[model samples]
Target: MTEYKLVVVGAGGVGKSALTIQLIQNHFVDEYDPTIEDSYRKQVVIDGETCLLDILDTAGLEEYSAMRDQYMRTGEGFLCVFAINNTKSFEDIHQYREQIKRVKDSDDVPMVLVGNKCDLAARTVESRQAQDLARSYGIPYIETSAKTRQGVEDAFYTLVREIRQH
Candidate 1:
């Protein structure tokens, strides 16, 4: 299997686990249960690619200094996530960028910016702004809604495609 260590960091209630689970298992988990380490792992197939995805979903810790460092040491690319309907979550991506850089093995490690929870158009925060944020980070971006399975597959495959190219 093609193995990749993946991490998803976001504030509490931002739907990190939901998106991760949906991408790996193709189902929505109704329980809002915070994971033990605020994360989980699974094997998934995307576009005929068999991949083992290690998801380090984070909790809404007031101070994520330690966890951020821990995730960085793992030596894999990341999907720094934010919610589409929440501007604050989107804005906090700077912190996520800084944190990931500190742990990134090199500038070559690809990160795919993900705006989760786009299923609720009534609450959407604009995909244009999200795309711009990705460009600013020098990374690709995709809006995903695990609830409706929108862009979830593309986000995963796009990240994998970038990694393969690198």
Candidate 2:
């Protein structure tokens, strides 16, 4: 079976695992668990081809700083996520982006900018700003709320398309 090594990169508490789990289980999990490893495999048919999506959720990834580049090296596509209500997480997106590029040694990489927690009214990072960042990176921007399952599949499917296009 065809497989895609997709990594979910984001700051902790940005609901990275939530998004991944929502896609995998079709259910919203309220509690966050960082101690356990988070990765999933889903056999999904995108467009016309069937492919297995291997997702690595980077929750508490910062703790294992030494192994950061290991995942980045193997990752073919990335979901750079941040919470809509988190200004700091939004600011940290650049760091992850640059590091990924540095690790890959290429400016062009298959990635998507994901703004999560769109269900909440208190958004600190607005939509246009996220779009602008995406435009700057020449990547797609998708707004999602794992709680309500809004734009969850589109975000992941879009990244797969980006990978195929690349």
Specify the highest-lDDT model's number.
2
Candidate 1 stretches with Cα past 4 Å from truth are: 36-39, 45-49, 61-68
Query: Counting only residues 3 or more apart in sequence or on different chains, how many pairs clash (N, Cα, C under 3 Å) in candidate 2?
Result: 0
lDDT of prediction 2: 0.89
lDDT of 2 at 160: 93
Candidate 2 lDDT over 26-98, as tens digits, reads 9898896756456689899898898999988775346565556677888999999999999999999998899
lDDT of each: 0.74, 0.89
- Candidate 1 lDDT over residue span 71-113, tens digit each: 6677366777888788888888887777677666455667899
Off by over 4 Å in 2: 60-62
